């Protein structure tokens, strides 16, 4: 009898270490073994440590702890945790169930209640959106009040991306502007493209931009005011609509019905994914997986290594404008107001049937959803009308 | 039409005007970026307005597209930074060169043409309150040009 | 090695001598040692590009006689 | 270099420095007397340390619970993290996935639990 | 179980370890087993930690009592030895209680009242320093540091020990907090006072030159000391305080001695003065000012020694200016470390000197300096009797480039150099085309290509002229004979600075010559307009009227008169004018230049408009081919406005007079402004809403 | 001078 | 006897055009110089009532686009 | 005094005028010296239009200065 001999000789920490390697069910089973085992689990805050470990290794649990509020007590009679764990599991189950059932709140925007957002990005504090009136609006994530307005772009602000220090936007006036996310003073202006900039991405000090001029430009960002063009990628015969990248490859989707994969190392043409009947409007590349939404009303999933069409998704009655995905689902938005939520785990499996992939079709609005970003708890979208829609699932 | 453009650049690099400066962006000799310094004794005092010039294939016989890059307050310039010089739309002449078009725009910066304007919401205030306009344009200049 | 001219708004052509591999910061400083404007209220413009305080004077393709324009930025911090 | 470890009984063992320094206790100590670790467990830990200078660890631990417990004590007294971590993970594996009664039958534990009903209703 | 026996045994073992006894390791392992079993019964083992702390406290109290109230010198060695032994004992003790240590540190959830074993020993020792020996040891080490006044050889280790102790004794929380404050403050104040006294005394019976060396040596010594036995953190602070208090108070004396040092050629002293003032922050102002003023004075004085024969000799002028600049440049480069600020002072000095030279006053025009420079460059490039070497020519050309870089009105120099180059090319006086090309390229790389544009055009044009002359001479093989050797340098009227001011008569012979040239020229250009220039044409003549067949090189004028004498030589000035059509202001000069020899005489001389000029036969010259061809109101306001806004944004709160004084001190270095100008500028800035009038001028956002 | 799907991207 | 004859004579002369450079307002080149589109390989000069002249290949294209003088808005006609 | 004016043909010329002549006279001189009617003329100096009904002194134009000649424009 280890659990009883170990603490008998003063090795309580060893016994607790032994019990810490158990899961939820095994832990309750051990708690129901004997009085001494129960005393060890109680005295050692075994349940609390279990919840802490879960929060440390799972995003869903983390998000729930920060949104629901019970995370405040993490990192207290030791009974609150043992009784809280079942409630947390219950909440997670309710979350996934309503995700597959279609429940929401649809919190509207609280400002003058007046439109035309082309790109949107949010966090837990603000919502940055690139309007069509040549301005950038920053809203509050909690009160939804229009916090600030950044002006200075000559044309319409098409795309944008920000981090904890700057806000890089690409407008229709063929210019890229670097703003200060804290204060809002225009820190830099890049004049290198001959036509409207359609998309841009940046991370780890490097950036990539694609404009209607059928060209791609990579930039080395040494500071918000020190950006230098490194190379000019050519090869596309049409307007490059979307461009994404990582440390391995850079994917470019243009209106020429093809996908191009170049090597980030020295901009080397690696592969070319073909199969789309029309131009590609949106795409996301991550974890060596590419998901593209084109004009053929279908969503194509591919493996960056082989470039094989793992699966084509049908059902969209219009052009798939934007699409996003995570480790669990794939949320897509086409012209007709129809937010289609698909399962990713079931899609990556070649044995699943096509009919069992489309989870739900949320239809509450009708305008062309231009942008939509989601996480494990909500979906923020923007279309022609209906300035901003928040799809909360809790 | 590359020889003419090269000669124009040579002239700009030899006899530069008072408040005009235009140079190529990168390797594309057909895409230049110019600058216009706000003329003195005007609401645009001490301001630098960036432009963007794009030369067509038959530039010597076709006006080049010129567009403002920094927002401004003027009855002949909308928010999109589009300019309405009749010498740029139909009355273009092969004699006019970049150093001339930029100077013409600079002159237009001071003397606006309220008659047949591009932004009525501004031309109205100009023809009615020539005082408030002097303050609004100044504020915008301090917000973008400066 | 070469000689440039920093034309101000009035017209006074401040002749300055620089090195083909100098830094715009040095060019901005030489002006005060000849005109009096600190390097915090200077915006050197050449060929339509606001000269950056880091790129070397060669990155702008500057040669002798190249006239730079100087516009004072009263605020300038 | 070789360090001389004198077990509790009196047996001596020669172990290389590169491996003997793995245990912080011996490292801080520098024959080396181990009044709480005998030659048997000493030979076992020496073999484990040399092999660790898993499947092998499982076979090395495919021993009764008595020797396992003694190994636990020796690892603690010698303060050898690696050995302690692997042995603890093994006991954990030996606990998980069974009903309470099955647990008692696994470690030959007698249920000492109203009390049983109280803990059953509360869990 | 029982603890009394095992605990007392462990205590006895520990007591034996505190003293370097070096007992059998078996006892060490036994003690480890004792502490291991003791932490077996958060409450387990607390008694052990408490006993350890109590024993440590008792031992330290006894030790301090043994070594309490000792002399200010033995206390140092005492504390050093005790600290060393205590550190060793605590280290081994931590190694013994390692088990208990690890347990506690990983159980109590740090963030109760326990820290660690080694840390506990240190914190406990921080009760034998604070109250019992904090002052004593510090004052002792300070007394030794000061004892270094005579260079005595201290232990050099008795101090390092105390320093390492103070450092390790740092806040044992979760670090030089307790060390820096105490040791630093004391050391800093003491060394500061010591240096003040030493400097004040040394300056009473010694010169500044020697004090500079003593100061430098002191700085190096203090920098090395704090780097050997003191901590490395106090290296920056101490050095700053020392260099500040040792130079600040004597900065004025440094200023005063700088002038006298500049007078003589004392480079070493200048270099050391710079190294010492450069170490301080913003102290080079007056130094740069003095250097500039002295260079200017030296320049003017050096040029005064040659102003009597300077306006007539360029060589000496350029050489003098070159020598002054070369010497000061070498000085600023070697002694002043080629500082980026001093070179500017030398620049302003050389500029003002070359533009306000005393020689300029003798000409009443500030354009005499570029003129002399051009004349010198021409003399260097001219084809003299001898030809200088290549390397020497290139070097002198570079020097000329330097003096040129310092000119103010480069346009006047361009015009002068252009005229000289033209006169050289036409008269075929160029020394070597390579030299001219190198000079042109140098001017190009110096002041761009626009300046050199005209010069290069002139060069290419002379070449084209030579080619055209060859073509015309080649077409002459046909039926078109010429009774004279003809040639011509057709230049392009677009670059040459030549103009037409003659309107000659074109004699009968030159009539046929010119007609034939035009006839041939009607084959390359249509809008051709040969604006003939006769005040440049050369001329060679032969005469048989004299005793021999003399030869004489002349111009078109002399040739005109000589050929006009082919009839009745009893001709007057009016008769000659009847066929020459030359302006008075130039005709009179022509007749004079002609008679400025024995070829044409009268029947200091005073020519008359009616005097006759008959043929002169009694002309007996001792030579042949005798050459008779004898030749900011707005800038002020702008700077004021910029300075005003700068000061305003700097303080944000001031008054009118205060603002005036501030702008006056920030602008004085440039020039002297006026108060009404400052007031008007303030109003101007008010028009742009840059500042306001508080309901007194305050900064505006 | 006088005058002379909204998805630009 | 009276032999006053010149043997060698060297003079200088500045050549110029008829009135002005008449710089072609199209290619900024010289009228006598070869046309610009003519250089990258018959290029005569054409005039207007305004006394304005350009190359034939230049004014021809400008006319093809608009029958108006480039230096002034009046009509165009040759000589 | 004298002023400098740059014509549309790239070439540069100078005019001998005093600070008393009117702008209309200046344009007339530019026309006779170049050959462009005044209706299609626009004088710019320091980035400012030169009104016809005025005189050089009204704009503070010193000697040796430069004037740019451009075509006519409107809204
Ligand atoms: Zn032409
Ligand atoms: Zn041609
Ligand atoms: Zn015409």
Q: What is the DSSP string of E497-534?
A: -----------HHHHHHHHHHHHHHTTT-SS---EEE-
Residue E440 and residue E444: Cα distance in Å, rounded? 6
DSSP character at residue E698: B
Q: Are E564 and E587 in contact (CB under 8 A)?
A: no
Which residue segment(s) compose the domain that H57 sits in? Answer: 2-70
Strand partners, A324: A331
| Residue E236 burial (C-beta neighbours within 10 Å; 0-12, 13-18, 19+) | exposed
H/E element holding E156? none
Those of residues 1-9 in F touching chain B at CB distance below 8 A are 1-4
Cα–Cα distance, C3 to C19 (Å, whole number): 9
CB atoms within 10 A of CB E252: 10
First and final C-alpha spacing in chain C:
32
Closest to A318 (Cα-Cα) out of A340, A295, A339: A295
* Number of CB atoms found within 10 A of residue A214's CB: 18
For residues H69 and H59, give the distance between their C-alpha atoms in angstroms, rounded to a whole number: 16
The strand pairing partners of E613, in sequence order, are E571
Q: How far apart are CA A333 and CA E697, in angstroms?
A: 59
Asked if A298 and A320 count as a contact pair (C-beta separation under 8 A), the reply is yes
Question: Whole-angstrom Cα distance, residue A217 to residue E191?
Answer: 61
What is the separation, in whole angstroms, between the first and last Cα of chain H?
Answer: 35
Give the N- to C-terminal CA distance of chain B in Å, as an integer.
36
- The rounded distance, in Å, linking the Cα atoms of E74 and E81 is 11
Asked whether A341 and A330 are in contact (CB, 8 A), the reply is yes
User: Tokens for E2?
Assistant: 């029982």
List, as ranges, residues 33-62 from H with C-beta within 8 Å of G: 35-37, 40
Residue C27 within a domain: yes
- How far apart CA A14 and CA B144 sit, in angstroms, is 67
Question: How far is it, in rounded angstroms, from Cα E538 to Cα E600?
Answer: 19
Q: Any residues with CB less than 8 A from the CB of E650 and at least 6 apart, and which?
A: none
Residue C77 lies in a domain: no
Q: Quick one: E377 exposed, middle or buried, by C-beta within 10 A (0-12, 13-18, 19+)?
A: buried
A1-98 matches A99-391 in fold: no
DSSP code at position H38: G
Q: Map residue C40 onto helix, strand or coil.
A: coil
Sorted by sequence, the CB contacts under 8 Å of residue E49 that are 6+ apart come out as E100, E104, E114, E120
Rounded to whole angstroms, how far apart are CA atoms G67 and D4?
110
Q: Which of B62, B91, B94 lies closest to G26 in CB terms? A: B94
Neighbours of A76 (CB within 10 A): 8
DSSP-assigned letter for residue E73: T
| Three-state secondary structure of chain A | CHHHHHHHCCCHHHHHHHHHCCCHHHHHHHHCCCHHHHHHHHHCCHHHHHHHHHHHHCHHHHHHHHHHCHHHHCCCCCHHHHHHHHHHHHHHHHHHHHHHHCCCCCECCECCCCCCCCEEEECCCEEEEECCCCEEEEEECCCCEEEEEEECCCCCEEEEEECCCEEEEEECCCCEEEEECCCCCEEEEECCCCCCEEEEEEECCEEEEEECCCEEEEEEEEECCEEEEEEEECCCCCCEEEEEECCCEEEEEECCCEEEEEECCCCEEEEEEECCCCCEEEEEEECCEEEEEECCCCEEEEECCCCCEEEEECCCCCCEEEEEECCCEEEEEECCCCEEEEEHHHHHCCCCCHHHCEEEEECCCCCCCCEEEECCCEEEEECCCCCCEEEECC
G52 annotated ligand binder: yes
CA-to-CA separations, E650 to A15, C76, E647, E689, in angstroms, rounded: 67, 11, 5, 17
Instruction: Residue B83: name the closest of B72, B96, B95 by CA.
Output: B72
Residues 6+ apart with CB under 8 A from E66: none
**CB proximity list for B85: less than 8 A, separation 6 or greater:** B66, B76, B101, B104, B105, B108, F1, H73
E563 within 8 A of E509, measured Cβ to Cβ: yes
The answer to whether A226 contacts chain C (CB < 8 Å) is yes
Residue pair A260/A234 in contact (Cβ under 8 Å)? The answer is no
Which superfamily does CATH assign the domain made up of A99-391 to?
YVTN repeat-like/Quinoprotein amine dehydrogenase (2.130.10.10)
E124 vs E64: CA distance, rounded Å = 13
Query: Shortest Cα distance from G20 to chain E (angstroms)?
Result: 10
- Count of residues for chain B? 146
Helix (H, G, I), strand (E, B) or coil at E488: strand
Q: What is the DSSP letter of E173?
A: -
Q: Which among E122, E105, E100 has a CA at the least distance from the CA of E7? A: E100
Kindly tell me whether chain C and chain G come into contact, counting contact as 3+ Cβ pairs under 8 Å. Answer: no
H/E segment holding residue C36: none
User: Which residues partner with E565 through β-bridges?
Assistant: none
Residues surrounding ion ligand 2 at CB below 5 Å = G 35, 38, 43, 57
* Pair A383, A369: CB distance under 8 Å: yes
Cβ contact E261:E269 at 8 Å:
yes
Q: How far is residue A293's CA from residue A299's CA, in Å, rounded to a whole number?
A: 5
* H helices, E strands: number in chain F: 0, 0
Question: For residue B94, how far is its CA from the centre of ligand 2 (angstroms)?
Answer: 16
CA distances (Å), origin B63, targets B53, B95, B98, E434: 10, 11, 10, 47
Sequence ranges of the domains in chain G: 1-79
G45 and chain B: CB distance < 8 Å anywhere?
no
Q: Which domains does chain D have, with CATH numbers?
A: 1-123 (3.30.710.10)
G22 is in an annotated binding site: no
Which residues crowd ion ligand 3, with CB under 5 Å? G 50, 52, 69, 71-72
Q: Are E648 and E691 in contact (CB under 8 A)?
A: yes
Indicate the number of domains in chain H: 1
Provide the greatest CA pair distance for chain F: 29
Rounded Cα distance, E388 and E382, in Å: 11
Q: What are phi and psi of E281, to 5 degrees?
A: -100, 125
Q: Of the bound ligands, which one is closest to the alpha carbon of residue G46?
A: 1
Question: Which alpha helices (H) appear in E305-389, and where do they start and end?
Answer: 314-334, 342-355, 358-361, 368-381
Within 8 A of A155 by CB-CB distance, chain B residues are 80-81
Contact E380, E396 (CB under 8 A): yes
CA C50 to chain centre: 10
Smallest Cα distance from H40 to chain G, Å: 7
- Bridge partners for A380 per DSSP: A373, A390
Task: Please tell me what DSSP assigns to residue E55.
Answer: H
Q: Do residues C3 and C16 make contact, with C-beta atoms less than 8 angstroms apart? A: yes
Contact (Cβ atoms closer than 8 angstroms) between residue E458 and residue E422: yes
Task: Please report where in the chains the tokens 């070439």 appear, as a residue.
Answer: H11
Q: Which domain holds residue C47?
A: 2-72
Residue E163: closest CA among E222, E80, E230, E78:
E230
Structure tokens at G53: 């002249």
Per-residue DSSP letters for B41-109?
SSTTTT-EEEEEEE--TTGGGSPPEEEE-S---BTTB-TT-BB--HHHHTS--TT--HHHHHHHHHHHH
Gap between the Cα atoms of G33 and C5, Å rounded:
34
What whole-number distance in Å separates Cα of residue E379 and Cα of residue E225?
63
Total residues belonging to chain E:
701
- Using a threshold of 3 CB pairs under 8 A, tell whether chains D and E touch: yes
CA distance E338 to E342: 7
Closest C-alpha to A186, from A157, A229, A213: A157
Q: Give the span between the Cα atoms of A41 and A19, in whole angstroms.
A: 7
H or E element, residue E399: helix E390-405
E450 touches chain B (CB under 8 A): yes
- Looking at the complex, does the CB of residue C73 fall below 8 Å from at least one CB of chain B? yes
Cα-trace Rg, chain E: 47
Edge to edge, the sheet with strand A206-211 lists: A197-203, A206-211, A215-223, A226-233
The ligand placed nearest to the CA atom of residue G54 is 1
In whole angstroms, give the CA distance from residue A232 to residue A236: 12
- Let me know if domain A1-98 sits in CATH 1.20.1280.50: yes
∠ CA E475-E481-E485 to the nearest 5 degrees? Answer: 85
What whole-number distance in Å separates Cα of residue E230 and Cα of residue E160? 6
Among chain E residues, the shortest Cα distance to C11 is held by E635
**Cα atoms in the 13 Å half-sphere on the side-chain side of B49:** 28
CA Rg value for chain D:
18
Q: Is C49 helix (H, G, I), strand (E, B) or coil?
A: strand
Cβ atoms of H70 and B104 closer than 8 Å: yes
Q: What does the CA dihedral G33, G35, G38, G40 come to, rounded to 10 degrees?
A: 80
The half-sphere exposure of D62 on its side-chain side, counting CA atoms within 13 A, is 5
Residues 6+ apart with CB under 8 A from A174: A155, A191, A193, A194, A195, A196, A197, A211, A213, B52
Angle at A140 between CA A136 and CA A142, to 5 degrees: 155
Q: Are H44 and H70 a contacting pair, CB within 8 Å?
A: yes
**C-alpha pair distances (Å), E552 with each of A249, A341, E574, E579, G7:** 88, 110, 25, 23, 11
Task: Report the candidate in A350, A244, A349, A332 with the shortest Cα–Cα distance to residue A288.
Answer: A244
Residues of B assigned a catalytic role = 84
Q: Is G30 annotated as a binding residue?
A: no
- Cα separation, H31 vs H9, in Å, equals 13
Cβ-Cβ contacts under 8 Å, H40 against chain G: 72-73
DSSP H12: E
Q: What's the CA gap between E562 and E636, in Å, rounded?
A: 63
Cα(first)–Cα(last) distance of chain E, in Å?
80
CA distances from A34 to A29, A50, B23, H63 (A): 10, 20, 85, 109
In degrees and rounded to multiples of 5, residue E367 shows phi and psi of: -95, 15
Q: What is the dihedral of CA A71, A77, A83, A84, to 10 degrees?
A: 0
Rounded distance, CA B39 to CA B45, Å? 6
User: What's E610's DSSP letter?
Assistant: S
For residues E504 and E533, what is the distance between their CA atoms, to the nearest angstrom?
9
What was the resolution (in A) of this experimentally determined structure?
3.7
* Rounded distance between C-alpha atoms, residue C75 and residue E649, angstroms: 7
Alpha carbon dihedral E544, E546, E547, E550, in 10-degree steps, equals: -70
SS3 at position G34: coil
Q: How many CB atoms lie within 10 A of CB H48?
A: 18
């Amino acid at each position: 009898d280890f659990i009883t001999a170990l603490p008998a000789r003063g090795l309580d920490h060893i016994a607790e270490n032994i019990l810490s390697y158990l899961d939820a069910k095994s832990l309750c089973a051990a708690e129901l073994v004997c009085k001494e085992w129960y005393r060890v689990t109680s005295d050692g805050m075994l349940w609390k440590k279990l919840i802490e470990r879960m929060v440390r290794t799972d995003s869903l649990w983390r998000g729930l702890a920060e949104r629901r509020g019970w995370g405040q007590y993490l990192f207290p009679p030791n009974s609150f945790y043992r009784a809280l764990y079942p409630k947390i599991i219950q909440d997670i189950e309710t979350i996934e169930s309503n995700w597959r059932c279609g429940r929401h709140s649809l919190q509207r925007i609280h400002c003058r209640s007046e439109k035309g957002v082309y790109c949107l990005q949010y966090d837990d504090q603000k919502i940055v959106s690139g309007l069509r009136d040549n301005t950038i609006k920053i809203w509050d994530k909690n009160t939804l009040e229009c916090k600030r307005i950044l002006t200075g772009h000559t044309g319409s602000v098409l795309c944008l991306q920000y981090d904890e220090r700057v806000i890089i936007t690409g407008s229709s006036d063929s210019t890229v502007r670097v703003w200060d996310v804290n204060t809002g003073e225009m820190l830099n202006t890049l004049i290198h493209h001959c036509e409207a900039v359609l998309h841009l991405r940046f991370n780890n000090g490097m950036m990539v931009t694609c404009s209607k001029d059928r060209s791609i430009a990579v930039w080395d960002m040494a500071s918000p005011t020190d950006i230098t063009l490194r190379r000019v990628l050519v090869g596309h015969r049409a307007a490059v609509n979307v461009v994404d990248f990582d440390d391995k490859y850079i994917v470019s989707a243009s209106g020429d019905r093809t996908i191009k994969v170049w090597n980030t190392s020295t901009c080397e043409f690696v592969r070319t994914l073909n199969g789309h009947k029309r131009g590609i409007a949106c795409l996301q590349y991550r974890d060596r997986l590419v998901v593209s939404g084109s004009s053929d009303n279908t969503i194509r999933l591919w493996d960056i290594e082989c470039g094989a069409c793992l699966r084509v998704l049908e059902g969209h009655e219009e052009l798939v404008r934007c699409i996003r995905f995570d480790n669990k689902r794939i949320v897509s938005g086409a012209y007709d107001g129809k937010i289609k939520v698909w399962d990713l785990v079931a899609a990556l499996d070649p044995r699943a049937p096509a009919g069992t992939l489309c989870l739900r079709t949320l239809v509450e609005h009708s305008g062309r959803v231009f942008r939509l970003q989601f996480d494990e708890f909500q979906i923020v979208s923007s279309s022609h009308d209906d300035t901003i829609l928040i799809w909360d699932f809790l | 039409a590359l020889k003419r453009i090269h000669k124009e650049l040579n002239d700009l690099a030899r006899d530069p005007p008072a408040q005009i400066s235009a140079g190529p962006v990168g390797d594309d000799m057909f895409h230049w970026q110019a600058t216009i310094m706000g003329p003195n004794d005007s609401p645009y005092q001490g301001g630098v307005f960036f432009l963007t010039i794009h030369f067509p294939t038959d530039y010597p016989f076709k006006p080049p597209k010129v567009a403002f890059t920094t927002r401004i307050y003027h009855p002949n310039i909308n928010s999109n930074g589009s300019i309405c010089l009749d010498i740029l739309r139909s009355q273009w002449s092969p004699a006019l060169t970049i150093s001339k078009v930029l100077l013409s725009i600079a002159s237009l910066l001071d003397d606006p043409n309220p008659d047949d304007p591009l932004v009525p919401e501004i031309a109205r205030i100009y023809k009615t309150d020539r005082e408030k306009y002097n303050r609004i344009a100044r504020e915008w200049t301090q917000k973008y040009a400066m | 090695s070469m000689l440039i001219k920093v034309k101000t708004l009035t017209g006074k052509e401040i002749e300055i001598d620089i090195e083909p591999t100098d830094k715009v910061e040095r060019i901005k400083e030489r002006v005060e040692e000849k005109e009096g404007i600190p390097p915090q209220q200077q915006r050197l413009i050449y060929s339509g590009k606001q000269m950056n305080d880091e790129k070397t004077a060669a990155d702008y393709k500057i040669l002798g006689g190249s006239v730079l324009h100087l516009v004072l930025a009263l605020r300038g911090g | 270099p070789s360090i001389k470890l004198q077990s509790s009984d009196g047996e001596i063992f020669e172990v290389d420095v590169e491996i003997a320094k793995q245990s912080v206790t011996i490292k801080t100590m520098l024959p080396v007397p181990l009044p709480n670790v005998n030659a048997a467990i000493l030979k076992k830990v020496i073999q484990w340390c040399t092999h660790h200078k898993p499947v092998w660890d499982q076979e090395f631990l495919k021993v009764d619970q008595g020797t396992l417990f003694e190994l636990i004590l020796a690892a603690n007294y010698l303060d050898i993290k690696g050995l302690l971590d692997v042995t603890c993970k093994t006991v954990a594996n030996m606990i998980k996935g069974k009903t309470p009664e099955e647990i008692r039958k696994t470690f030959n534990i007698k249920n000492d639990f109203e009390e049983e009903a109280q803990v059953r209703k509360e869990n | 179980i029982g603890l009394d026996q095992i605990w007392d045994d462990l205590r006895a073992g520990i007591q034996q370890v505190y003293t370097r006894q070096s007992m059998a390791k078996s006892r060490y392992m036994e003690l480890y087993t004792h502490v291991y079993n003791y932490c077996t019964s958060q409450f387990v083992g607390l008694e052990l930690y408490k006993r350890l702390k109590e024993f440590l406290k008792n031992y330290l109290t006894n030790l301090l009592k043994d070594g309490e109230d000792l002399m200010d010198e033995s206390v140092l060695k005492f504390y050093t030895q005790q600290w060393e032994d205590y550190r060793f004992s605590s280290k081994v003790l931590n190694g013994i209680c390692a088990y208990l240590n690890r347990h506690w540190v990983r159980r109590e959830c740090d963030e109760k009242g326990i820290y660690e074993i080694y840390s506990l020993a240190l914190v406990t020792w921080r009760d034998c320093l604070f109250r019992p020996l904090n002052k004593q040891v510090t004052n002792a080490v300070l007394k030794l540091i000061e004892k270094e006044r005579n260079g005595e050889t201290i232990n050099t280790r008795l101090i390092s020990g105390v320093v390492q102790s103070y450092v390790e004794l740092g806040l044992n929380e979760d670090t030089l907090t307790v060390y820096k404050e105490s040791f630093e403050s004391q050391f800093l104040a003491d060394t500061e006072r010591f240096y003040t006294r030493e400097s004040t005394e040394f300056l009473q019976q010694n010169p500044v030159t020697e004090y500079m060396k003593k100061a430098e040596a002191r700085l190096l010594e203090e920098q090395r000391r704090v780097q050997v036995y003191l901590h490395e953190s106090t290296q920056d602070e101490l050095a700053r305080k020392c260099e500040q208090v040792l130079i600040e108070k004597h900065l004025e004396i440094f200023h005063t001695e700088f002038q006298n040092l500049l007078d003589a050629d004392k480079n070493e002293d200048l270099g050391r003065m710079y190294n010492l003032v450069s170490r301080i922050q913003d102290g080079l102002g007056e130094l740069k000012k003095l250097l500039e003023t002295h260079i200017h004075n030296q320049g003017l004085a050096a040029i005064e020694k040659c102003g009597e024969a300077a306006l007539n000799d360029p060589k000496m002028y350029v050489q003098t200016v070159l020598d002054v600049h070369k010497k000061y440049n070498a000085l600023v480069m070697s002694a002043f470390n080629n500082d980026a600020g001093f070179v500017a002072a030398l620049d302003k000095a050389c500029g003002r000197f070359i533009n306000n030279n005393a020689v300029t006053k003798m000409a009443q025009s500030s354009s005499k300096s570029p003129e002399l420079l051009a004349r010198y460059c021409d003399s260097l490039l001219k084809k003299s009797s001898k030809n200088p070497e290549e390397a020497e020519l290139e070097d002198t050309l570079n020097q000329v480039m330097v003096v040129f870089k310092y000119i103010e009105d480069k346009d006047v120099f361009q015009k002068f150099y252009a005229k000289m180059l033209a006169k050289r090319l036409v008269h075929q006086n160029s020394a070597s085309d390579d030299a001219e090309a190198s000079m042109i390229s140098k001017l190009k790389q110096a002041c761009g290509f626009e300046y050199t544009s005209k010069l290069q055009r002139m060069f290419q044009d002379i070449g084209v002229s030579k080619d055209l002359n060859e073509q015309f001479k080649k077409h002459l093989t046909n039926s078109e004979p010429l009774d004279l050797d003809f040639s011509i340098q057709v230049l392009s009227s677009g670059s040459w600075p030549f103009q037409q001011s003659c309107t000659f008569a074109l004699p009968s012979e030159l009539e046929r010559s010119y007609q034939r040239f035009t006839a041939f020229y009607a084959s390359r250009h249509s809008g051709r307009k040969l604006t003939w220039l006769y005040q440049l044409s050369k001329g060679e003549l032969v005469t048989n009227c004299f005793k021999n067949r003399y030869t004489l090189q002349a111009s078109t004028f002399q040739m005109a008169i000589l050929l006009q004498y082919n009839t009745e030589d009893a001709y007057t000035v009016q008769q000659l004018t009847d066929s020459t059509q030359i302006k008075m202001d130039i005709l009179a000069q022509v007749l004079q230049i002609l008679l400025k020899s024995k070829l044409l005489v009268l029947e200091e001389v005073e020519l008359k408009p009616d005097t006759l000029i008959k043929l002169y036969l009694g002309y007996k010259n001792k030579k042949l081919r005798v050459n008779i061809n004898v030749p900011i109101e707005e800038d002020r306001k702008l700077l004021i406005q910029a300075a005003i806004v700068r000061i305003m944004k700097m303080r944000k709160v001031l008054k009118h007079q205060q603002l005036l004084g501030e702008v006056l001190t920030q602008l004085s270095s440039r020039f002297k402004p006026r108060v009404p100008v400052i007031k008007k500028c303030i109003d101007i800035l008010i028009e742009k809403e840059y500042l306001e009038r508080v309901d007194t001028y305050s900064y505006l956002a | 001078c006088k005058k002379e799907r909204h998805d630009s991207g | 006897k009276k032999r006053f004859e010149v043997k060698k004579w060297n003079a200088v002369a500045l050549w110029a055009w008829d009135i002005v450079v008449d710089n072609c307002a199209i290619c900024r080149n010289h009228i006598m110089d070869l046309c610009i589109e003519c250089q990258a390989n018959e290029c005569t000069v054409a005039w207007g009532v305004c006394n304005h002249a350009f190359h034939f290949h230049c004014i021809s294209r400008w006319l093809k686009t608009r029958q108006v003088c480039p230096l002034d808005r009046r009509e165009w006609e040759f000589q | 005094m004298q002023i400098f004016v740059k014509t549309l043909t790239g070439k540069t010329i100078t005019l001998e005028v005093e600070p008393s002549d009117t702008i209309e006279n200046v344009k007339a001189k530019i026309q006779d010296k170049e050959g462009i009617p005044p209706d299609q003329q626009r004088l710019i100096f320091a980035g400012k239009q030169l009104e016809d009904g005025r005189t050089l002194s009204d704009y503070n134009i010193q000697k040796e200065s430069t004037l740019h000649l451009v075509l006519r424009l409107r809204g």
